[PDB]
């Protein structure tokens, strides 16, 4: 490599620097290096899962002050954090601003207290219905427009490549829930999530209804689910069907 | 004060700053308080008795000089320390740990002493001098805040590239940057920067990159030529980056035609050396041109 | 001073913001595609349901006859270029290996001149799979241009999905169902595995009320039971 | 090498005809279809037709002639060669054609072209200006010249109030004329050529930076550039234009006159264009460019 002679050069150099990495810590280290090269002090990477629908897990990892992590998770500020929630509605980056935080005043005041006074956040959705987010933050310099655009591009590239590499390394933060369905069980669930009953599936797949209900039981067992509705809903939310 | 864009005359420069000695190798004076003062840049040896004179015009007591800031180790930015520190009892020299340790390394200080002994005026009489490892030095680190005075809070910033130890000082209150040679030698006749890469180009360019990010500058003070202001000082870092890449383009093109390093070194010397004849033997200027062209040919991105 | 590519980005944005009609958006897309060196392009939206027969709508500039053929044989179901997006966010350069599973489609596309091309996927913020393809006939994708292209296509499709959502295109539109906070929270609880009685307990209402709410929800989806409702709501990002 | 600089074939499809100083470019659209670019001068016609004979078997198959702008060094062949390629459509911007319709502009061009003949050369046959086979083109127009030649027109005002450039999207090849400047053969950097408007010049370089990364960059003087030189061509030209701006502003803040820098620039640069540009016009053009820059450059504080 990442250097000077053009944007494409920095892109290819970053890729080549990240290819040999077989340890997640080094991936995050390269990311931090480039973030500081951009001009900011801290960064963060968050993953919002879709379930549980009432309290969807939002896992986080970054380089904000550890005390701020303690406070953030203690009071579960991660649930209704505007920087993360913008990604559910938009593919555009969000520059931190008082107007954006009008709904969550306590969080913004505490973050300002910890030095996170200026920053930005970019969302992108993984091909498995996950909401990944990349935030950068500094203390004293406001984001000018031209630098806003520069950031948007560089952060997009960085987060895309980061999620790619973390999927290739099977990080626990992204692993969500390791569930594999067999071809038969997956198609049975496809039919069930389309509204078919045990008998209609038995007819269509040319198998018995007892077999179909036992497949349902296995599927439930994998999802740790009490009925078919939870299995179907979580499978639809996870992109398994 | 003034309408001018470059202030290049001994005397007062701002409401707290003064330029002392020769504008070519100046020493800058900051008034931290009624009875507290600080220096910046170490200049050359042969100006010791001139600077001192100027200094005593502004300060009633030399004991009120409490700090002396040094950018790097090269002979032309530290040669006054051994001679005038004996007259400034209350002074701390502040330099980077690489620069601090250079003064301990016998060979380095010998190069310093030699090059600074070579720039005397016929029958110049050097005054007595103290040891390089006897200086009252405190090492500073990247990003440290130097609480020099109540209204003087300068940050240290690592600016490797020009040398393996170069650092610069940012007075954030006045958006003033003492940048030494990390941007280069300002061309007084054309208004553009002459790159001075004498250790590593990647680090030099990364340092200029980082200095571009600072708040818009109002005052830009390199090690040679005085003080720049206005729009000349605001985009100074970007301009130095640009001129360095321009010289890279020149070198790479000339080599694609089959030229040698020495040829372009001679050309660059012809066109530049005239400025630094007073404080730099021409042969060392040519050798520095050759060295910079070496580094550029090594680390510059090829064209294929 | 931060990359000459930034200029192209700024220019494209400036060109596409003042447009309030989709036809012009697609026209700008064609402009940039041809400026890169390709002949035709395409933009596809794969919905998540029906899971067995998922809707695949498309808009582009291929010969109309090949569109007739494509929909006639429902190539949108098992198109490898589109299905790549279900598991990866990386660009796909057209290659025999990619099409080994669906040779008929690739053979016929080659017959129509679509011999070289690429396809980039992206996920809209509403669980829809949008994809952008470019194609030409005679020149293989060289290495450096491959990456340059990839980046440009990513930027273009991001801004395209944004602007078409801002323009409320029908192809991006999904099954129109609106739920209130109470029924939405009831469905959140049901999709978490709670029974009627447990939901009634938690919300401090009666179980008859909760089953009547279930009927309310089912009526909108044209659904036969609660499982279909929960699955479609999860797939649509409503809970 | 990194620079191509010779009459004859450039690559698998194109040829440089005549003088590399005032070259004309030949596109092979197909088995039996050809096109031309740049109108050149009178003085190299006698080199044109002959060197052309080494590549084209029949002159009648030239169907298009592209003209960047109305300067004498990129337009002056219309009396010489146009009459004998009868199926040709000249394609040019409204500005350029209109300039060709005004007697004053054609007189300037004819005098400047006459200044360059040898005391031995005789003039070949000549036709009128308003009889030319002209068709107006627009910014961004798509020229389906050939099966593998789809080129776009791009308005690049600044160097002149009419300059335009041509981008081959398939080969990522850009004919830029003078909109980037005069390539310094000894240093490898760009010499700005701002002879009408600086803001338009810089905005044109901006709009050109937006093209895909270039493989081949073809200016009006010096041949063809490849590799890095072609990729950051627009960026580097922009940078050198701003560098000259700063030099001029600095020199003026010291009390120097535009003559001071004009004479110096002539001394250091004119040697390159002595073959196709009278030295006095080079000095005058340096002064014109410095005047425009001093007019439109951003001041300091
Ligand atoms: O960047 C985000 C989203 C991810 C937050 O990640 C965090 C939060 C706390 C500790 C750590 Br470590 C990471 N939110 C912003 C809102 C303003 S302060 C902040 O963290
Ligand atoms: O791009 C796609 C998906 C369909 C988008 O293209 C189309 C299809 C139908 C009508 C229109 Br208009 C454009 N598939 C690729 C696979 C290789 S050839 C091809 O078109
Ligand atoms: Fe130095
Ligand atoms: Fe120095
Ligand atoms: Fe011209
Ligand atoms: Fe010309």
Author numbering:
A (entry chain C): 1 to 241
B (entry chain A): -2 to 301
C (entry chain D): 3 to 241
D (entry chain B): 1 to 301
Quote the study's own text.
The majority of traits controlled by rhl transcription factor RhlR depend on PqsE, a dispensable thioesterase in Pseudomonas Quinolone Signal (PQS) biosynthesis that interferes with RhlR through an enigmatic mechanism likely involving direct interaction of both proteins. Here we show that PqsE and RhlR form a 2:2 protein complex that, together with RhlR agonist N-butanoyl-L-homoserine lactone (C4-HSL), solubilizes RhlR and thereby renders the otherwise insoluble transcription factor active. PqsE is a thioesterase that triggers transcription of the RhlR regulon through a hitherto cryptic mechanism, which we identify here as involving a significant chaperone-like component that enhances the stability of RhlR via protein complex formation. In common with many other gram-negative bacteria, two QS circuits use N-acyl-L-homoserine lactones (HSLs) as autoinducers, namely N-(3-oxododecanoyl)-L-HSL (3-oxo-C12-HSL) and N-butanoyl-L-HSL (C4-HSL), which are produced by autoinducer synthases LasI and RhlI and activate the LuxR-type transcription factors LasR and RhlR, respectively.
We, therefore, investigated whether both proteins engage in a complex when affinity-tagged variants are co-expressed in E. coli. This was indeed the case but required the presence of the cognate autoinducer C4-HSL or of the synthetic RhlR ligand mBTL. The PqsE segment adopted the same dimeric configuration as in the free protein but with a slightly twisted arrangement. The RhlR sequence displayed the expected homodimeric structure of a LuxR-type transcription factor and C4-HSL as well as mBTL were found in the anticipated ligand binding site. The acyl chain of C4-HSL points into a hydrophobic pocket of the ligand binding site in RhlR, again with high similarity to related structures. This pocket extends beyond the butyryl group of C4-HSL and is not fully closed towards the solvent, explaining why ligands such as mBTL can be accommodated without obvious changes to the structure and suggesting that RhlR could sense other HSLs as well. The butanol-m-bromophenol group of mBTL resides in the hydrophobic acyl-binding tunnel leading towards the lactone binding site, and the m-bromophenol establishes π-stacking interactions with Y64 and Y72, two residues also contained in wildtype RhlR. The synthetic HSL analogue mBTL has been developed as a RhlR antagonist, however, using pyocyanin production as a proxy for RhlR/PqsE-mediated quorum sensing, we observed that mBTL induced similar levels of pyocyanin as exogenously supplied C4-HSL in a ΔrhlI mutant of P. aeruginosa PA14, suggesting again that stabilization is a key factor of RhlR-mediated signaling.
